[PDB]
Amino acid sequence: MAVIADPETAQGFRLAGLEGYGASSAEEAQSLLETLVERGGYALVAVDEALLPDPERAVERLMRGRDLPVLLPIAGLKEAFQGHDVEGYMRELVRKTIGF
């Protein structure tokens, strides 16, 4: 695995039982993200909502399809955050399904 998150929160996912290779190195973590999924020698790759890639096309064009998922939303910090309910719901309705 790898979880791709903030440096300090990336820290807590490198612990045993889990395998992380996080940290920020960009504002969408491109510096890392790209290089890492290119091999696809991690069981799971996950990109948080404290980064999240504004061009998802960038990744798809480089990995060249994947049977394992990518960019699973994790919050990426704690501040009592739970806006990732309604945010993900609308993330869905904008690109697919019905409008508003």
Add this chain to the structure above:
Amino acid sequence: QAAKEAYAALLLAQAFDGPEVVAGAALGVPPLEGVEAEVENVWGSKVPRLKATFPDGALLSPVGTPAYTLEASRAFRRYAEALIRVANTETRLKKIGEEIKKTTR
């Protein structure tokens, strides 16, 4: 929130208790298919799914920080478990993409 609870409260009491915590706990998930991938043929093309369950232990690291160590180990579960939901919906997203596009087409 209950994962992070302990994590973020074990960063300046860790960076030298990082060693201890990783030791007692169950060693890393495999990087080649540590997750359990499932194949499934369904309308909206053949899309594969998966569930994130693997071993990581809980409440079983010996020595170290009284509360935080054990509470951080237990927290690994709240990654695993939680991740299954997004494990099924983001793969469902790619299926319902196919349908929607062919439909309007």
Add this chain to the structure above:
Amino acid sequence: DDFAYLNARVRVRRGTLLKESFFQEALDLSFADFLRLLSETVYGGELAGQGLPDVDRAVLRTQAKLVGDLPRLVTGEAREAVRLLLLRNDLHNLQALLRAKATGRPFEEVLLLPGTLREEVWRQAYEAQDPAGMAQVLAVPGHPLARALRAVLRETQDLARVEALLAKRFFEDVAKAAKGLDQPALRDYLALEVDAENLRTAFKLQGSGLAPDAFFLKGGRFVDRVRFARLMEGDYAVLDELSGTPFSGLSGVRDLKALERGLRCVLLKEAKKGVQDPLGVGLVLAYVKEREWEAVRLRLLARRAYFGLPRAQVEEEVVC
């Protein structure tokens, strides 16, 4: 030998200990205001950067020169008595060091401060290439924690096991030496440290199906094998029969976090009333628990402020 100069050096130092009313102020502050406050204190005096890695480092370096320099300043009979206290902070370094040699990972990401084993002992040990040689390099400062290590290393080379049998054997070693160095103040405390360890060994390994007699080692006050066995089944009714000890406060509590919080606060309390016995090791005893606990609250208050965590999540853990 002698604690006459050394106690005196510590008494001046007890002047620059952080009182309760600092942590009270600090909770009301944001991270920017926290940083201005912190710089007034002696931990502040080692500060080197606004961010988190730097706070962890300023704290640690303050502990390295004001607390970790105590065993050098005495010798002999004085030194053995002070040493046992210091040894717990050395065991933390040792367990991590033993683990960097064995699993082949770098020297880095470990705890280093001086205590009884110097920085150079840990570097020479690291670079040693036979576990037996690693062990003689450690045996150079002289201490019961060598003698404890040496016996465990004869039975095994498995990491998890060395860690457990070293800790068990080490507190047993400590206890016998400590009983022979006398003083009522140290004896009462020693009893609590072992009792707390016993409870705590039971909690960490809870429900692993193992023996409950393995979690009880001599030094006790009121705890025994049966309480451990019930506790291991998951029953906390045992803590509700535990009074006459200052762990009276663990009654009616069943969360691991509240339970373990409780033991650290009790140990703090014994040591804080050892200043009615400041002669010999009593005062130093009180001084080490307070520097340790203080350092811990500034790290928790700094984390709490930086990431904007909930106040009550930390307000409770920064007071006893």
